[PDB]
Subunit: 219 residues, 6 copies
Amino acid sequence: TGYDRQSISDTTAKILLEVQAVHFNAEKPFISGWASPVYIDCRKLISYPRVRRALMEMAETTITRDIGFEQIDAVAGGETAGIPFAAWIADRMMVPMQYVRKKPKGFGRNAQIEGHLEEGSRVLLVEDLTTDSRSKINFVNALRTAGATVNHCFVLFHYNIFKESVSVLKDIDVDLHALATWWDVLRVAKASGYFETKTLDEVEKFLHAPAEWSAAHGG
Amino acid sequence: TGYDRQSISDTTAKILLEVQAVHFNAEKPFIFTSGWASPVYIDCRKLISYPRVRRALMEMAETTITRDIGFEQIDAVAGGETAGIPFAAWIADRMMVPMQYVRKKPKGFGRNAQIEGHLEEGSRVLLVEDLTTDSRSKINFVNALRTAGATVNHCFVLFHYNIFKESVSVLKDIDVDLHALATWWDVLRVAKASGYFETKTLDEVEKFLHAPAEWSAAHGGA
Amino acid sequence: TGYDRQSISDTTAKILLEVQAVHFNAEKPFIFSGWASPVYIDCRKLISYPRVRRALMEMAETTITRDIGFEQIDAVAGGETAGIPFAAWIADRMMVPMQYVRKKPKGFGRNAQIEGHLEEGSRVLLVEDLTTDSRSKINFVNALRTAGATVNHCFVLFHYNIFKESVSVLKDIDVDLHALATWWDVLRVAKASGYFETKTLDEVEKFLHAPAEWSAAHGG
Amino acid sequence: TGYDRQSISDTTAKILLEVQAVHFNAEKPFIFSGWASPVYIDCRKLISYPRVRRALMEMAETTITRDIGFEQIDAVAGGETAGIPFAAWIADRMMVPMQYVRKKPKGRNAQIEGHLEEGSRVLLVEDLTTDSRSKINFVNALRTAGATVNHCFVLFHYNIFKESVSVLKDIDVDLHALATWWDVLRVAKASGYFETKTLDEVEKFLHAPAEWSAAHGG
Amino acid sequence: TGYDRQSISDTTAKILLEVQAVHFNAEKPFIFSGWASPVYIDCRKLISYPRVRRALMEMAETTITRDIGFEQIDAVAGGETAGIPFAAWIADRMMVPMQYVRKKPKGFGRNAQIEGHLEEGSRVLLVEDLTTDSRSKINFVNALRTAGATVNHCFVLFHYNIFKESVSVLKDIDVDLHALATWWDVLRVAKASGYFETKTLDEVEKFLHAPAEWSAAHGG
Amino acid sequence: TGYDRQSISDTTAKILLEVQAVHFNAEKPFISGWASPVYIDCRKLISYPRVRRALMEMAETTITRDIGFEQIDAVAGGETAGIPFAAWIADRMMVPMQYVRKKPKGFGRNAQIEGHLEEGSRVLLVEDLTTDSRSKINFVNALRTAGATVNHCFVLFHYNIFKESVSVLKDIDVDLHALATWWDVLRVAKASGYFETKTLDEVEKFLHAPAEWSAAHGG
């Protein structure tokens, strides 16, 4: 459902707002602390068939356009949230699928990885969303310990409100690819006109300075 | 795909033996984490790394579901955590139905803590897992789905051990039917027919299958 | 979805009984026209179920390819109202042009009863939801033949059977009748399932063996 | 198959003109109940071409998802013998149940063939719209059976009559179309396969339909 | 399309006889290098029929998966202008890289006879339209093995199965031959159909049982 | 993976450079004489599944947009070169397939054509690539001898550096449709930045004057 980056992001934002995977609440923030007015549950997108089909089509388009057609030999999912999306992407791309556990279960170079992973394979990490890309280090290092070549990471949603969201993965030579960001959702919601002005202003203030807003509203 | 139980089972056994998802070792039995000793090891998670194998497995899964259960008797597909999520996703894609997945432990307030994804009240849900041994871990997931309002009467597994007496009755006591593509007997029969395995190993496997607990106690150690 | 004639009929009967497209009631027969029967079928309900209709279309394509042939049909024509969805799906599966025939003419030309484009000499397969005595099929067959199409085959999802002329009327005008299931298949599958009482199935069997006598005895 | 609205309309007009589903005749107007018109559209010819219908159904799905939403439709109900094939193809693409509505009742669910769950959201699919007067009956028939009808889809929209849209908005039904007569006129003018006089007469008709029909006989 | 070997063979024979890719003529034998024969097969006609070639590809994939295995082939290599379309379709269905082998080398190097990228150690399946004595397959097998490919299987839509060394010549170099139908299957289906005269089918049977003697007796 | 002509051409150029079907060498020109700094092997394209799927989608889009949806009744391919692409296009278009031999084998109308060709059929000629379209004359005449109507020709790559590459086909009333040209590959390579400036300048001066460059560099 899109061709260029902007259309893909707009379609992703519309999909997220339509299935109510994105929630806004400025009066009662969503609190592990970190009170925020925005809540996202990308795991609801697996319960809507047309939505997930469109999202996977756009995911394949993004992977082909930004990475390459013959640069990925396997698709590895996250712990439990990115496994369905990884499975669908692997089926579309006709590549082997693996998934990486959060904690090792056993001894060896393939303890964290479930599935068959050939030596030297080029693996693409796929999970639902990122906030700081700090949970990405464990999975990338687990895949690299087993011999895979991890240089690209795909996620449905990217917060893009923290400075080290993309620099952390770049320092370990991993590129972050995302279908949409919080700014795209904010722009689509502002254009739609179904949200009150005060709520959108509060959301914009939070997205500009996340830590300051969180600390000053119950963090 | 065979469109009948025997052909589906034989094809699944050949698939498992070809990709070496099933291992036989009688000289050095597989001592598991719980101390159980068995000469047979199966890793259904390896099947997701082979495109054609997984495609055929999902086609046979859809055929089994539509034959044993029915075409319009399932409203959603739920997968157990980690192991069965890819198979649940593929089955949901083939069946054009919503997909959810059940966590092993609750994380949330209630009535939706153990289930990730939207679940409409009164929806008939099919539980998909990679394999079952005694079907006592499936009760937790079935109760989690029923707590959210889903009506669970069927559970699908790629592999069913079928070597424990209460493998199916434990689910049937809570009104859940167990459907599977292949059993250990099917794999043993196909391995015997193939002839790539020595007679002693297959005899040991047959002895274990006929008496699991005694074999675990004696030949490998409790 | 099956691969053999016996497997297709059993699967179709199970599909019909599962989605309740077939109803049995011997205590209060379905008095249609004055005809009285203990059986009722509504093949139009099969289009409201995605998986059921997909399976039925797969079996329809399999039956067409096995009985008629892979390259013997150049267009798929559906009857008025009822058979148009099935004709559309079969044409999509077979990658052939689709037409549909109105019950009554809408003009004065040769292509008055046909809504579509029909090239001269095209071999056309006529698709309908069900047939009872195939007396209404002659109108559609003659309408297609007036346009120049060559009609030698007709496909129906459900064949009522019972009546002896149901295939002879079409065979007299060189049209072969193909079907997925009959009433006998549905009755056999219902008896095997065990969800229906013995008295009801006995009444249905008596009706199937003697339709006119049963209608006269239990109604008009 | 295009992506944006303009591309979809342009290639839909190209498809209509290529399969000759659109006819222009200024010298001898088409007497339809009179109403002499120089333009003729036969959208039922579109089902006899496989590639054309595949492209059109892809564009229909794209338009439905883009303008209505991905999960706003639970059933697709066509007209009677006009848009039933298009409704079937759209329902198959959308993985959504199909129904269809008759012109006249036969026997709540007397006018609807198929299973229609109460409270379901139903999309009307028809071959074309002229004044959207015949769609009132189908929308009311579906709403009698409990369905929620808020969107109507048609392959071709005349867009030359003022009430062709507002009559559906009065009953809270949105009209979605793949192409209009203006798109066909623009594509025909750009192609250059039509004489200038014919296109000028067609444009004059499209600006004032009733006056042109009355002047030329009707 | 079928599910077992016998069903696949029968369906393929019906397909070949329906599209007239197989011709029978005992009065005027097909003399082609001499070698008069009453049978003629043109497997290159099957690419001009969409449904026929789609069904043939389904059956080809089923045979490959059933006999060889799901994960035992890494590339599909066609012959020279004859099996290239079939190889392309099989590779698309199997989601594997495709190559094709020239009849004669064009250049110098290990990859002189092979067009397309072939990774070292790849297990390659050779696809052709038909084998008469499989003497020409040795050249393609050796060309593929020169570039590092491991060739242990060869798939063909049709296999004559009337020469003793049809399968042994490939088996001597560790290549297994798989086919959808043989001349015996076509003869059996033609006899069952009844569209062919008894004398013609008797002559074909005599030729199939002893091809060299029949050719010597009827010319060539 | 494209919508318009420009996007399709750019994606085709990226595909060709990614799988290394396009080679640049200014210091040592390749090679019947005609030393050139550019080498293209479109037959490598059939060994990559995702690449060939994307290229066939683009081919179908181009054929439908430029020729028409119902203007082609058969697809014929050149011998040994465009047969796989013709097969994939025919499968996509649910249209019969034929292929034309370079040299006739037999006598009578259909001696040079393999497959079933109905009289009056509209046939699209498919080839891997064309340089001067001199070899397409034989195939077009062979198809027209059998009764086919040939008015369109499709090639994945078009050199577009010779003046008669399109006029020679237009003289016999045949149109040439292509996915990419050498200019578009050059533009994509220049934008990518993976090639040295001297090599790209030499390639550009070759593509401007091919014959002069070949004569000057020992051709």
